[PDB]
Amino acid sequence: MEDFKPTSTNQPGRQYPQVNSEGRVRARIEAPQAHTVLLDIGGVRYPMTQGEDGAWIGDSRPQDEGFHYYQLVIDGARVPDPGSLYFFGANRWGSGVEVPAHDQDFYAIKDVPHGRVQKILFPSGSTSTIRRAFVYTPPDYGKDLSKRYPVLYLQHGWGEDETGWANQGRVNLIMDNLIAEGKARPFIIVMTYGMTNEIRFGGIREFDIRPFQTVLVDELIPYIDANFRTRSDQPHRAMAGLSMGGMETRLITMNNLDLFSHIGLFSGGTISASDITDRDVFKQKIKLVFVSCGSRENPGRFRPAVDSLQQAGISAVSYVSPDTAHEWQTWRRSFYQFAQLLFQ
Amino acid sequence: MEDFKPTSTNQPGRQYPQVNSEGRVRARIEAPQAHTVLLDIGGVRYPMTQGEDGAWIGDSRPQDEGFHYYQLVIDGARVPDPGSLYFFGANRWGSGVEVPAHDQDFYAIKDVPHGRVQKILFPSGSTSTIRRAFVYTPPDYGKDLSKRYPVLYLQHGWGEDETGWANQGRVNLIMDNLIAEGKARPFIIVMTYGMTNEREFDIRPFQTVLVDELIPYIDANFRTRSDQPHRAMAGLSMGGMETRLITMNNLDLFSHIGLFSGGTISASDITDRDVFKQKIKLVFVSCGSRENPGRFRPAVDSLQQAGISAVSYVSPDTAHEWQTWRRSFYQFAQLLFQL
């Protein structure tokens, strides 16, 4: 249906790209000497055609609800859409487009109290670098100066970085809206780079967790607890991650039961009772194991894993995002469900 | 010569663009079916040609030291370089490239205490919107909760937005390094959108946002000194024009004025000179040496002759570009909120 409208991810003043009520995305670009121009979204290349105004224009098929990385192909060159905002993901800075969702209210910008997203730079002795992190502080962090807060360490997937959760993830807005409705306790969120994207060729294990585990446990957690008003005890520290960041969370939390008490794995593995080296300490220390994925992924793995944990007396929850796959809508919804269960 | 190296503004792992010791920029892109590919930088479209490996590659003439907006043109399509970081400027999100500078240390990431750049969302009754601002807080802001800090309101130019000063301006690093050397007093910096990009400009919408909404929000939510001796405003280009209009209309709110490549104040512009001298501790005006520095000299002289604390600064070998404004701020910040 011809009800295309500017998307919310358009650069200021840009009328294209557009999205219609079906979720189709319409891209447009001026390229007056080009010959072959395509829209690359959802894993498909859609031919674009020159209209009466000379500009190339073309429609995708209906996209899943939520956020999608995409690009244009201009006579063979893969390039970001000049009309849209840019995000780091798919291992590039590039265009993303927002497709309206039936449940999009939970990440809307509302007139409610808003927390801050604070960019910090922390020294990393194990890597000889100064490293970026983004820290969400809840809306009344600056008012209640005697109050101290739990902390969630929240990680991105392969091809992403420390900006993912606060931009395409809209995590600050999800928190602001949950806190306003009384559905989540206020807590701090720390987002850093998970050291996931630099290609390596180890043969002992597929991924060596030690570099990032050292940065997180030995450097970032002490920095956060020293510089923010946190509750720095095990029941008030959690970790979650998506995709490879969920694999990192799984390995780091299971190896540091004295530091983390809630575990969130979004499209990033599961924990089964037989996986746990010491089930007794696990049962006493871990208050929540949460696993999630999109309905287009492999949710069938969840029932045996959750059952195995519940049979061992371990609090386990699974969640499936309907009609989505390995994309940010799955992870926004996962976080929205997970956040409501933390630090009860 | 052929000593090109990846620039510090490349996307992770990307080997292009590159810059050589002269300040030439080299761009490269795969476009297997293209016929005409250009590097657009410094107002010049430079031809890129297919090398042996099929990729298009081409060099600019030497660029001034510092940061430069640029783009590529592929068979007529103006696009950001897939290989560089992106910045908001020239009224788009698009490519920028960093050319090494002899004095780049002052905006380097050093082993010093670091402040925070805090993104806030404040409500605006006059526009019925929730608006973004970025707030730099100095390194030890969180250590003593009894201390309160002066505030600088710092504005971008036309075609830019609230991200400019903390990204391409590297303002947090400039402050961190100045504070570490004891050359600047710690203060807070507030950067919001100046409502410039949407012909006598109507200052009222932004003045209302800044004066009636953002200043009260900041003083109510950050540990600030909310009196006029501890509030400053500065801006570059059209943001300097906005600064001139707003500060001159609100002498009871601002005591220090910075205008970077953005107009001047002459003694004749001042309605009451005696009170201006009472209220205003600094009028700082700057530009790049390639702009028209001479133009500013009569105006600054007229202020000094009238006993007004007016200072001028000229950035060597730069034009209407961010290196001028980084250096301007570096000099200006050392003069703010003196004891």
XYZ file of C-alpha atoms in Angstrom:
683
model
C 0.000 0.000 0.000
C 1.200 3.514 -0.913
C 1.470 4.931 2.607
C 5.252 5.305 2.717
C 6.600 7.762 5.282
C 10.039 9.042 6.332
C 11.610 6.620 8.808
C 12.715 7.733 12.279
C 16.342 6.893 11.426
C 16.548 9.467 8.629
C 19.182 12.173 8.797
C 17.679 15.577 9.631
C 15.509 16.895 6.832
C 15.854 13.782 4.667
C 12.593 12.476 3.233
C 14.108 9.115 2.225
C 14.384 6.285 3.112
C 10.724 5.584 3.785
C 8.706 2.746 5.276
C 5.104 1.743 4.614
C 2.511 0.091 6.840
C 3.614 -3.351 5.613
C 7.208 -2.797 6.720
C 8.572 -2.321 3.207
C 11.574 0.011 2.983
C 11.839 2.476 0.068
C 15.291 3.886 -0.697
C 16.103 6.809 -2.974
C 19.382 8.244 -4.230
C 20.508 10.683 -6.902
C 23.187 9.060 -9.078
C 22.751 10.658 -12.489
C 25.495 8.752 -14.346
C 24.961 5.386 -12.641
C 23.601 2.298 -14.362
C 22.842 -0.277 -11.634
C 21.694 0.743 -8.147
C 20.384 -1.655 -5.501
C 19.032 -1.625 -1.962
C 20.718 -4.237 0.226
C 18.529 -5.037 3.252
C 17.427 -8.190 5.048
C 19.920 -10.277 3.096
C 18.446 -9.429 -0.313
C 19.484 -6.970 -3.025
C 16.486 -5.098 -4.444
C 16.862 -3.396 -7.849
C 16.225 0.347 -7.832
C 14.919 2.182 -10.905
C 15.158 5.743 -12.191
C 11.879 7.632 -11.838
C 10.599 10.740 -13.587
C 12.802 12.959 -11.424
C 15.864 10.942 -12.465
C 16.623 9.624 -8.974
C 16.961 5.900 -8.324
C 14.159 4.510 -6.154
C 13.193 1.009 -5.098
C 11.229 -0.978 -2.535
C 12.134 -3.981 -0.422
C 9.746 -6.736 0.612
C 8.205 -6.439 4.102
C 10.863 -6.371 6.792
C 10.587 -7.761 10.301
C 9.610 -5.212 12.932
C 12.506 -3.214 14.348
C 16.012 -2.134 13.349
C 17.956 -3.320 10.297
C 21.470 -2.728 9.021
C 21.489 -1.981 5.319
C 23.460 -0.394 2.497
C 23.235 0.658 -1.128
C 25.113 -0.782 -4.088
C 25.994 1.842 -6.718
C 27.611 0.396 -9.864
C 29.285 -2.224 -7.669
C 30.258 0.057 -4.737
C 28.765 -0.877 -1.367
C 28.069 2.397 0.479
C 25.992 3.711 3.357
C 22.712 5.365 2.454
C 23.535 9.115 2.636
C 19.994 9.795 3.898
C 20.043 7.743 7.088
C 21.770 7.765 10.460
C 24.817 5.543 10.937
C 25.467 2.774 13.450
C 28.362 0.447 14.155
C 27.279 -3.091 13.297
C 27.955 -5.765 10.723
C 31.595 -4.764 11.358
C 31.194 -1.303 9.813
C 29.847 2.120 10.454
C 26.871 2.194 8.110
C 23.194 2.939 7.624
C 20.406 1.441 9.675
C 16.655 1.778 9.255
C 13.866 1.615 11.846
C 10.758 -0.359 10.833
C 7.771 0.444 13.089
C 6.785 -2.281 15.549
C 3.496 -3.011 17.272
C 5.288 -2.873 20.639
C 7.606 0.024 19.843
C 6.220 2.054 22.762
C 8.644 0.428 25.215
C 11.618 2.085 23.498
C 9.873 5.378 22.665
C 11.101 8.797 23.778
C 8.452 9.784 26.320
C 8.111 12.740 28.691
C 9.295 10.725 31.697
C 12.396 11.248 33.850
C 15.468 10.410 31.741
C 18.753 8.929 32.806
C 22.095 9.832 31.291
C 24.498 7.950 29.017
C 27.975 8.849 30.235
C 31.069 8.336 28.101
C 34.085 7.433 30.236
C 37.697 6.593 29.449
C 39.401 4.050 31.689
C 43.056 2.927 31.729
C 43.689 -0.705 30.828
C 47.050 -1.951 32.083
C 46.705 -5.424 30.590
C 46.388 -3.959 27.079
C 48.344 -0.694 27.467
C 45.360 1.255 26.166
C 42.839 3.835 27.321
C 39.434 2.312 26.668
C 35.953 3.682 26.066
C 32.834 2.697 27.961
C 29.310 4.062 28.081
C 27.512 4.065 31.434
C 23.756 4.501 31.765
C 22.833 6.118 35.066
C 19.131 6.106 36.035
C 17.000 9.250 36.062
C 17.344 10.220 39.731
C 21.012 9.210 40.037
C 22.086 12.824 40.556
C 19.284 13.683 42.980
C 19.560 10.786 45.466
C 23.218 11.313 46.307
C 23.105 8.943 49.292
C 21.715 6.135 47.118
C 23.875 3.477 45.484
C 22.832 1.250 42.612
C 23.214 -2.280 41.264
C 25.146 -2.640 38.007
C 24.540 -4.655 34.833
C 27.467 -5.205 32.444
C 25.873 -5.455 29.006
C 27.705 -6.628 25.890
C 27.297 -6.459 22.107
C 27.825 -9.133 19.444
C 30.328 -9.732 16.680
C 30.757 -6.757 14.348
C 29.483 -4.285 16.976
C 31.035 -2.187 19.716
C 30.379 -0.248 22.912
C 27.940 2.109 21.148
C 25.462 -0.594 20.119
C 23.239 -0.954 23.167
C 22.729 2.786 23.744
C 22.084 3.637 20.085
C 20.398 0.901 18.070
C 19.572 -0.879 21.333
C 17.919 2.274 22.758
C 18.752 0.827 26.168
C 18.535 4.159 28.029
C 14.986 4.683 26.781
C 13.972 1.119 27.612
C 15.235 1.698 31.161
C 13.661 5.168 31.497
C 10.248 3.817 30.492
C 10.482 0.709 32.699
C 11.530 2.749 35.734
C 8.744 5.265 35.132
C 6.175 2.446 35.073
C 7.677 0.765 38.153
C 8.496 -2.376 36.167
C 12.262 -2.282 36.753
C 14.374 -1.269 39.717
C 16.789 1.545 38.828
C 20.260 0.237 38.061
C 23.439 1.318 36.257
C 24.415 -0.226 32.920
C 28.038 -0.459 31.758
C 28.754 -1.109 28.050
C 32.284 -1.572 26.713
C 33.999 -3.196 23.754
C 34.072 -6.997 24.087
C 37.202 -7.462 21.972
C 35.241 -9.618 19.542
C 36.049 -8.369 16.043
C 39.813 -8.750 15.576
C 40.418 -12.026 13.774
C 42.566 -14.606 15.569
C 43.681 -18.176 14.875
C 43.858 -20.066 18.160
C 43.508 -23.831 18.175
C 43.120 -24.616 21.883
C 39.619 -23.111 21.965
C 37.542 -21.229 19.403
C 37.593 -17.969 21.398
C 40.095 -16.999 24.085
C 38.024 -15.294 26.800
C 40.975 -14.249 28.943
C 41.772 -10.847 27.345
C 38.234 -9.502 27.776
C 37.693 -11.264 31.104
C 40.821 -9.499 32.404
C 39.676 -6.085 31.150
C 36.195 -6.543 32.616
C 37.032 -8.187 35.944
C 40.427 -6.684 36.762
C 39.995 -3.164 35.323
C 36.478 -2.032 34.388
C 34.553 -3.408 37.383
C 37.008 -1.819 39.864
C 36.945 1.448 37.887
C 33.126 1.537 37.881
C 32.856 0.707 41.581
C 35.456 3.392 42.390
C 33.907 6.164 40.262
C 30.133 5.545 40.328
C 27.814 5.119 43.333
C 27.412 1.382 43.043
C 26.466 -1.527 45.270
C 29.667 -3.506 44.788
C 28.611 -6.884 46.100
C 27.750 -10.064 44.244
C 23.918 -9.945 44.600
C 23.932 -6.506 42.909
C 26.076 -7.256 39.855
C 24.761 -8.865 36.668
C 26.027 -9.557 33.162
C 24.262 -10.035 29.843
C 25.188 -10.116 26.207
C 23.935 -10.865 22.729
C 25.428 -13.340 20.242
C 29.202 -13.510 20.850
C 28.685 -11.192 23.814
C 26.351 -13.811 25.224
C 29.043 -16.441 24.781
C 31.399 -14.095 26.646
C 28.826 -13.566 29.403
C 28.300 -17.317 29.734
C 32.012 -18.063 30.130
C 32.781 -15.089 32.385
C 29.805 -15.466 34.712
C 30.241 -19.229 35.125
C 33.906 -18.606 35.998
C 33.113 -15.731 38.394
C 30.175 -16.791 40.553
C 31.617 -14.613 43.356
C 31.124 -11.507 41.145
C 27.869 -12.008 39.194
C 24.433 -13.138 40.376
C 22.231 -12.698 37.281
C 23.039 -14.015 33.799
C 21.436 -13.004 30.503
C 22.186 -14.776 27.218
C 20.432 -13.243 24.183
C 20.838 -15.322 21.004
C 24.065 -16.480 22.606
C 23.970 -19.932 24.115
C 22.339 -21.656 27.030
C 23.354 -23.108 30.389
C 22.339 -26.678 31.226
C 22.773 -28.261 34.651
C 25.324 -30.725 33.255
C 27.401 -27.726 32.098
C 27.908 -26.518 35.689
C 31.083 -27.760 37.380
C 29.750 -27.003 40.889
C 25.959 -26.956 41.028
C 25.779 -26.317 44.776
C 27.649 -22.998 44.751
C 25.851 -22.088 41.513
C 22.434 -22.647 43.087
C 23.365 -20.516 46.099
C 24.954 -17.648 44.140
C 22.981 -17.336 40.869
C 19.534 -15.762 41.225
C 18.580 -15.869 37.526
C 19.691 -17.547 34.313
C 17.787 -15.908 31.443
C 18.046 -17.126 27.843
C 16.301 -15.747 24.784
C 16.329 -15.669 20.986
C 14.096 -14.803 18.061
C 11.418 -17.178 16.889
C 13.342 -17.547 13.603
C 16.432 -18.822 15.463
C 16.608 -22.058 17.490
C 14.302 -21.628 20.520
C 13.813 -25.402 20.693
C 17.023 -25.664 22.686
C 15.486 -23.722 25.566
C 13.117 -26.310 27.068
C 15.775 -28.965 27.911
C 18.173 -26.338 29.255
C 15.594 -24.511 31.382
C 14.152 -27.806 32.639
C 17.601 -29.092 33.607
C 18.251 -25.919 35.620
C 14.834 -25.879 37.305
C 15.268 -29.556 38.230
C 18.539 -28.524 39.901
C 16.786 -25.796 41.909
C 18.199 -22.971 39.771
C 16.023 -20.037 38.740
C 15.839 -20.188 34.925
C 13.693 -18.275 32.423
C 13.423 -18.390 28.631
C 11.927 -15.800 26.278
C 11.272 -15.852 22.526
C 10.882 -12.644 20.510
C 8.088 -13.304 17.974
C 8.754 -12.981 14.240
C 12.360 -11.801 14.551
C 15.783 -13.332 13.978
C 19.415 -12.385 14.732
C 18.664 -8.677 14.805
C 18.306 -5.862 17.342
C 14.540 -6.181 17.819
C 15.180 -9.589 19.388
C 17.730 -8.034 21.745
C 15.660 -4.974 22.653
C 12.785 -7.242 23.660
C 15.158 -9.616 25.441
C 16.568 -6.767 27.501
C 13.085 -5.413 28.229
C 12.060 -8.801 29.630
C 15.371 -9.378 31.465
C 15.557 -5.936 33.093
C 12.240 -6.518 34.881
C 13.707 -9.541 36.668
C 16.983 -8.074 37.942
C 17.779 -7.154 41.526
C 14.327 -7.986 42.898
C 56.365 11.695 -0.945
C 55.082 8.100 -0.758
C 54.760 7.883 3.012
C 50.979 7.559 3.194
C 49.574 5.904 6.317
C 46.050 5.068 7.520
C 44.436 8.070 9.147
C 43.301 8.057 12.766
C 39.719 8.543 11.513
C 39.457 5.186 9.706
C 36.875 2.568 10.586
C 38.353 -0.373 12.501
C 40.750 -2.367 10.381
C 40.379 -0.133 7.329
C 43.667 0.738 5.648
C 42.162 3.620 3.637
C 41.844 6.570 3.608
C 45.505 7.436 4.180
C 47.477 10.653 4.683
C 51.078 11.446 3.823
C 53.566 13.737 5.573
C 52.579 16.636 3.304
C 48.937 16.376 4.357
C 47.679 14.828 1.117
C 44.673 12.519 1.565
C 44.462 9.253 -0.381
C 41.095 7.549 -0.861
C 40.370 4.063 -2.212
C 37.119 2.255 -2.975
C 36.032 -0.921 -4.766
C 33.481 -0.012 -7.450
C 33.954 -2.682 -10.115
C 31.337 -1.352 -12.568
C 31.869 2.387 -12.071
C 33.316 4.796 -14.629
C 33.950 8.091 -12.763
C 34.998 8.176 -9.086
C 36.055 11.354 -7.302
C 37.391 12.428 -3.917
C 35.597 15.621 -2.810
C 37.647 17.490 -0.199
C 38.541 21.117 0.432
C 36.140 22.315 -2.244
C 37.888 20.318 -4.991
C 36.870 17.133 -6.790
C 39.988 14.973 -7.312
C 39.987 12.177 -9.915
C 40.366 8.620 -8.673
C 41.608 6.020 -11.143
C 41.477 2.243 -11.323
C 44.726 0.600 -10.285
C 45.901 -2.854 -11.273
C 43.762 -4.495 -8.576
C 40.657 -2.785 -9.988
C 40.049 -0.484 -7.021
C 39.676 3.254 -7.547
C 42.396 5.316 -5.862
C 43.332 8.992 -5.879
C 45.122 11.719 -3.943
C 44.224 15.266 -2.945
C 46.612 18.205 -2.800
C 48.064 18.930 0.645
C 45.423 19.790 3.233
C 45.774 22.069 6.234
C 46.561 20.413 9.560
C 43.501 19.130 11.401
C 40.029 17.808 10.608
C 38.266 17.991 7.236
C 34.820 16.994 6.013
C 34.843 15.079 2.748
C 32.888 12.671 0.573
C 33.197 10.481 -2.502
C 31.345 10.778 -5.807
C 30.582 7.524 -7.620
C 29.102 8.000 -11.092
C 27.367 11.124 -9.797
C 26.319 9.741 -6.395
C 27.654 11.767 -3.457
C 28.311 9.261 -0.656
C 30.336 8.933 2.524
C 33.597 7.020 2.319
C 32.724 3.485 3.503
C 36.130 3.402 5.175
C 36.057 6.430 7.484
C 34.323 7.436 10.690
C 31.323 9.749 10.361
C 30.604 13.175 11.786
C 27.687 15.578 11.562
C 28.719 18.622 9.556
C 28.041 20.294 6.245
C 24.439 19.516 7.208
C 24.946 15.757 6.816
C 26.287 12.754 8.615
C 29.327 11.923 6.537
C 33.027 11.267 6.287
C 35.735 13.290 7.994
C 39.482 12.855 7.867
C 42.134 13.813 10.418
C 45.417 15.239 9.075
C 48.224 15.119 11.684
C 49.213 18.493 13.175
C 52.436 19.739 14.734
C 50.479 20.708 17.888
C 48.079 17.751 17.977
C 49.281 16.819 21.482
C 46.775 19.234 23.037
C 43.806 17.119 21.827
C 45.558 13.760 22.256
C 44.308 10.961 24.465
C 46.923 11.058 27.232
C 47.521 9.161 30.470
C 45.790 11.835 32.549
C 42.591 11.990 34.592
C 39.633 12.046 32.203
C 36.307 13.827 32.470
C 33.029 12.429 31.187
C 30.876 13.357 28.236
C 27.323 12.907 29.497
C 24.346 12.668 27.138
C 21.192 14.156 28.654
C 17.602 14.519 27.462
C 15.915 17.641 28.734
C 12.284 18.660 28.283
C 11.480 21.813 26.324
C 8.136 23.496 26.944
C 8.608 26.082 24.200
C 9.082 23.442 21.475
C 7.071 20.563 23.026
C 10.033 18.223 22.569
C 12.617 16.231 24.514
C 15.997 17.604 23.462
C 19.530 16.194 23.487
C 22.540 17.886 25.056
C 26.076 16.727 25.820
C 27.698 17.815 29.075
C 31.408 17.568 29.790
C 32.142 17.174 33.486
C 35.753 17.547 34.671
C 37.840 14.608 35.864
C 37.203 14.953 39.620
C 33.564 16.071 39.329
C 32.395 13.048 41.326
C 35.016 13.177 44.088
C 33.875 16.180 46.195
C 30.090 16.570 46.276
C 30.340 19.947 48.045
C 32.202 21.549 45.121
C 30.324 23.387 42.373
C 31.669 24.358 38.986
C 31.375 27.200 36.476
C 29.655 26.391 33.189
C 30.485 27.188 29.551
C 27.699 26.909 26.953
C 29.491 25.955 23.726
C 27.867 26.052 20.306
C 28.512 24.625 16.832
C 28.150 26.218 13.409
C 25.634 25.947 10.616
C 25.321 22.396 9.302
C 26.534 20.962 12.638
C 24.791 19.854 15.826
C 25.293 19.045 19.517
C 27.780 16.254 18.701
C 30.321 18.491 16.990
C 32.354 19.849 19.891
C 32.816 16.509 21.659
C 33.611 14.511 18.512
C 35.436 16.459 15.820
C 36.149 19.203 18.400
C 37.653 16.689 20.881
C 36.653 19.160 23.571
C 36.822 16.663 26.446
C 40.421 15.781 25.616
C 41.378 19.445 25.295
C 39.925 20.054 28.760
C 41.461 16.924 30.318
C 44.923 17.940 29.109
C 44.574 21.604 30.124
C 43.357 20.643 33.612
C 46.220 18.163 33.987
C 48.764 20.866 33.180
C 47.041 23.416 35.413
C 46.439 25.715 32.427
C 42.646 25.711 32.819
C 40.363 25.770 35.820
C 37.931 22.827 35.881
C 34.543 23.768 34.487
C 31.495 22.098 32.954
C 30.706 22.462 29.237
C 27.170 22.230 27.841
C 26.652 21.555 24.121
C 23.177 21.481 22.596
C 21.651 22.041 19.167
C 21.559 25.710 18.184
C 18.511 25.372 15.908
C 20.551 26.681 12.967
C 19.880 24.219 10.138
C 16.093 24.365 9.574
C 17.025 35.727 5.853
C 17.461 37.656 9.118
C 17.892 34.886 11.682
C 15.280 34.820 14.466
C 17.316 34.213 17.642
C 14.262 33.835 19.869
C 13.654 30.062 19.547
C 17.201 29.099 20.545
C 17.544 31.919 23.078
C 14.346 30.718 24.777
C 15.585 27.111 24.800
C 18.972 28.081 26.190
C 17.937 30.778 28.654
C 14.507 29.585 29.824
C 15.006 25.819 29.652
C 18.531 24.456 29.352
C 20.294 26.812 31.798
C 17.696 26.100 34.535
C 17.890 22.360 33.789
C 21.687 22.337 34.026
C 21.784 24.373 37.238
C 19.118 22.123 38.774
C 20.718 18.799 37.745
C 24.477 19.444 37.801
C 26.608 20.853 40.614
C 27.051 24.305 39.101
C 27.776 27.817 40.281
C 24.662 29.500 38.929
C 25.754 33.152 39.191
C 26.791 35.297 36.236
C 30.542 35.463 37.033
C 30.621 31.669 36.560
C 28.681 31.366 33.301
C 30.207 31.734 29.827
C 29.084 31.229 26.234
C 31.075 30.647 23.057
C 30.350 29.536 19.538
C 31.889 29.047 16.119
C 30.584 30.549 12.858
C 26.769 30.857 13.025
C 27.004 29.668 16.641
C 29.278 32.638 17.322
C 26.623 34.898 15.841
C 24.104 33.290 18.194
C 26.526 33.766 21.086
C 26.988 37.450 20.289
C 23.242 38.093 20.151
C 22.358 36.084 23.245
C 25.174 37.293 25.496
C 24.655 40.940 24.552
C 20.927 40.589 25.306
C 21.642 38.772 28.610
C 24.584 40.561 30.253
C 23.122 39.533 33.635
C 23.563 35.841 32.697
C 26.963 35.598 30.953
C 30.303 37.129 31.962
C 32.616 35.653 29.298
C 31.995 35.684 25.524
C 33.837 33.667 22.891
C 33.351 34.233 19.144
C 35.253 31.774 16.900
C 35.139 32.789 13.218
C 31.742 34.226 14.077
C 31.594 37.985 14.083
C 32.914 40.637 16.408
C 31.750 43.159 18.992
C 32.785 46.790 18.535
C 32.597 49.466 21.196
C 29.910 51.147 19.068
C 27.751 48.001 19.322
C 27.563 48.380 23.108
C 24.640 50.374 24.484
C 26.129 51.105 27.921
C 29.904 50.772 28.062
C 30.304 51.315 31.804
C 28.010 48.435 32.741
C 29.496 46.234 30.007
C 32.903 46.684 31.660
C 31.282 45.902 35.016
C 29.611 42.716 33.825
C 31.860 41.252 31.125
C 35.233 39.819 32.118
C 36.260 38.622 28.668
C 35.387 39.147 25.018
C 37.474 36.650 23.031
C 37.397 36.760 19.228
C 39.290 34.441 16.901
C 39.631 33.180 13.332
C 42.048 31.261 11.152
C 44.968 33.023 9.506
C 43.529 32.082 6.091
C 40.214 33.825 6.910
C 40.230 37.596 7.130
C 42.001 38.194 10.478
C 42.652 41.847 9.614
C 38.871 42.338 9.535
C 38.606 41.746 13.299
C 41.352 44.158 14.327
C 39.415 47.476 14.285
C 36.624 45.952 16.390
C 38.911 44.488 19.048
C 40.923 47.687 19.151
C 37.759 49.720 19.763
C 36.945 47.512 22.761
C 40.432 47.734 24.259
C 40.507 51.512 23.841
C 37.245 51.602 25.823
C 38.798 49.609 28.678
C 36.960 46.391 27.865
C 38.759 43.078 28.436
C 38.942 42.017 24.785
C 41.347 39.384 23.438
C 42.010 38.213 19.874
C 43.598 34.998 18.620
C 44.536 33.815 15.108
C 45.057 30.123 14.311
C 48.098 29.702 12.028
C 47.620 28.130 8.597
C 43.948 27.192 9.020
C 40.663 28.394 7.549
C 36.950 27.960 8.358
C 37.547 24.462 9.714
C 37.714 22.655 13.032
C 41.453 23.056 13.699
C 40.794 26.816 13.997
C 38.084 26.132 16.548
C 39.969 23.517 18.535
C 42.874 25.965 18.927
C 40.492 28.848 19.634
C 38.872 26.862 22.447
C 42.275 25.781 23.810
C 43.263 29.453 24.127
C 39.849 30.626 25.347
C 39.506 27.989 28.066
C 42.756 29.132 29.707
C 41.193 32.572 30.266
C 37.838 31.467 31.707
C 36.825 31.884 35.336
C 40.133 33.291 36.558
C 40.607 33.600 40.312
